[PDB]
Design a protein around this ligand. Structure first.
Ligand SMILES: Nc1nc2c(ncn2[C@@H]2O[C@H](COP(=O)(O)O[C@H]3[C@@H](O)[C@H](n4ccc(=O)[nH]c4=O)O[C@@H]3CO)[C@H]3CC(O)(O)C[C@H]32)c(=O)[nH]1
Ligand SMILES: [Cl-]
Length: 396
C-alpha cells in the first residue's frame, strides 16, 4: 500500500478533486509530497488533491503547455519563477491572495520571487539552496580545513586530488553548477535590463571549471546525480542542491559533511542558487477545485507540513513558523546539517525570471558549458555562441 495507492482510493470517493501536476520522479521529494497529500486528504470531507507525476520539471512544463493547447489544465502545478512568467503571458494563473491564502511569515527570499508587478502568483513549496557537500574523512585524512573561500576551495581540491591521485571536486557540467561560480566571481546575468551569458565573470567561471578538469582536481559527472556516482574514486566536495541531502546521507559510505558555500571572503558565505518550485493555481480550474487548492496551500504552509517536508528532503522550510515547530526542532537538535541548510538559505541568488529562461539554461547556456567541459571548446567562444543564440531566441 504505497501512498499513491491510498491517494487513488481517497480521490475515488471524493466529491471534488484538484489535480496537482509535479516533477518529482522518485526518492524522498516524491515520498514526502505524497505523505503530505495522504494527511491533507484524511482531514478533508470528500475533497482531495491528486498528485500526478509528469516526469521531471521540464517534462512538467512541456505537459502544462500541451494542457493549455488541449484546454485541460490541472488545478495546481509546480513552477519555477521563469515558468510563472511564461504562464502569465498566457493569463493562466490565479493571483494567490485572491483565494485568501495568508502569506505573512513566508521568507521574503521566496515570496519576493513569486511576485510579478506587485502580485503573488505562486506559493513557495519545495525551495532548495546549494550547499557544500563534503567528505569529512578525506579532508581529516590530509589535514584540510573545510574551505571558507573560493581560493581555499581551489587549494583544497588541488591538495586532495594530488594526495588521492584523482579529481576530488565532483560537478555536473550544467547552468546550476555554473551559477555558483558565476555569482561568487561577481557575475550577473542582467546588465541594463539585457540578458548577458558571455560577460567577463561568465568566461572566468567557465574557465575555472575547465582548468579544474585539465589540472586534475575537477571531475565532470555525465551519468546520474553526484550522489549516484559516490564509491567510484576519491570524493571530497560537491556543490549541489540541498534537496539531494537525504540521498547523499543514504549513499555516502564515508562521514558526509554539509557546510555553507565558499565565498569571495570569510566575511560572508558564498551565494547558493535557489532551486525547486512554487505551487500555482490555474484560472481555468473550477471554483470548487480552487477552494480545495486554498485549503491545500494553507496546509502546505503550516509549520508541521513544512517541518516534516524539509526534514524528509533537505529542502529549506519556507516559513519562520516551520523553524519554531517541535518536529523540526527535534530533527535539528539531532542533526546540525538542517541549521546549515537554513544558514545557507540566507545567502541566496535566483536565475532570471524571463519566460524563455528554461530553454536558455538547458539548450543554450547548458550546451555551451558542456561544449567547454566535455569537448574542450574555448570558454569565451562557447559563451559568445550562447549569447548569440539567446539574443536570437529573445528577438523571436
Ligand atoms: N525545468 C527546470 N528545471 C530547473 C530550472 N532551474 C533549475 N532547474 C533544475 O532544478 C533542479 C534542482 O531542483 P531541486 O528541487 O533543488 O532538486 C531536485 C533533484 O535534483 C533532487 N534529487 C533527487 C534525487 C537525487 O539523486 N539527487 C537529487 O539531487 O530532488 C529534487 C526533486 O527531484 C536542477 C536539476 C536539473 O534538472 O539538472 C536542472 C536544475 C528551470 O527553470 N526549469
Ligand atoms: Cl522511488
Amino acid at each position: 500500500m504505497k501512498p499513491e495507492d491510498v491517494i487513488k482510493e481517497q480521490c475515488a470517493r471524493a466529491k471534488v478533486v484538484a489535480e496537482l501536476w509535479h516533477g518529482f520522479t522518485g526518492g524522498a521529494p516524491k515520498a514526502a509530497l505524497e505523505n503530505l497529500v495522504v494527511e491533507f486528504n484524511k482531514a478533508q470531507q470528500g475533497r482531495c488533491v491528486r498528485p500526478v507525476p509528469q516526469g521531471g520539471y521540464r517534462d512538467l512544463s512541456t505537459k502544462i503547455k500541451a494542457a493549455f493547447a488541449a484546454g485541460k489544465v490541472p488545478t495546481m502545478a509546480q513552477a519555477f519563477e521563469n515558468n510563472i512568467a511564461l504562464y502569465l503571458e498566457a493569463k493562466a494563473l490565479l493571483p494567490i491572495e485572491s483565494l485568501g491564502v495568508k502569506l505573512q511569515g513566508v521568507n521574503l527570499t521566496f515570496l519576493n520571487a513569486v511576485r510579478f508587478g506587485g502580485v503573488v502568483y505562486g506559493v513557495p513549496f519545495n525551495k532548495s539552496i546549494q550547499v557544500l557537500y563534503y567528505n569529512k574523512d578525506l579532508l581529516k585524512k590530509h589535514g584540510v580545513p573545510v574551505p571558507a573561500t573560493l581560493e581555499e576551495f581551489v587549494a583544497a581540491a588541488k591538495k586532495l586530488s594530488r594526495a588521492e591521485g584523482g579529481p576530488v571536486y565532483w560537478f555536473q557540467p550544467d547552468a546550476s553548477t555554473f551559477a555558483y561560480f558565476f555569482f561568487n566571481l561577481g557575475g550577473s546575468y542582467l546588465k541594463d535590463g539585457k540578458l548577458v551569458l558571455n560577460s567577463k565573470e561568465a568566461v572566468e567561471a567557465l574557465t575555472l571549471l575547465q582548468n579544474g578538469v585539465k589540472e586534475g582536481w575537477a571531475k565532470p559527472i555525465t551519468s546520474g546525480a553526484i550522489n549516484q556516482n559516490l564509491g567510484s574514486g576519491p570524493y571530497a566536495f560537491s556543490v549541489d542542491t540541498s534537496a539531494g541531502y537525504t540521498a547523499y546521507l543514504r549513499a555516502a559510505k564515508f562521514d558526509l559533511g554539509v557546510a555553507t558555500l565558499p565565498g569571495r571572503t570569510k566575511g560572508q558565505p558564498g551565494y547558493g542558487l535557489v532551486q525547486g518550485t512554487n505551487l500555482v493555481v490555474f484560472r481555468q480550474a473550477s471554483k470548487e477545485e480552487q477552494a480545495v487548492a486554498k485549503d491545500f496551500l494553507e496546509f502546505v504552509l503550516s509549520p508541521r507540513a513544512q517541518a516534516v517536508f524539509a526534514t524528509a528532503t533537505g529542502y529549506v522550510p519556507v516559513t519562520e513558523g516551520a523553524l519554531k515547530d517541535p518536529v523540526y526542532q527535534a530533527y535539528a537538535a539531532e542533526n546540525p546539517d538542517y541549521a546549515t541548510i537554513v544558514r545557507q538559505s540566507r545567502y541566496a541568488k535566483f536565475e532570471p525570471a524571463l519566460a524563455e529562461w528554461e530553454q536558455i539554461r538547458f539548450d543554450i547556456l547548458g550546451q555551451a558549458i558542456k561544449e567547454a567541459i566535455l569537448n574542450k571548446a574555448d570558454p569565451k567562444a562557447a559563451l559568445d555562441r550562447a549569447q548569440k543564440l539567446a539574443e536570437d531566441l529573445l528577438s523571436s
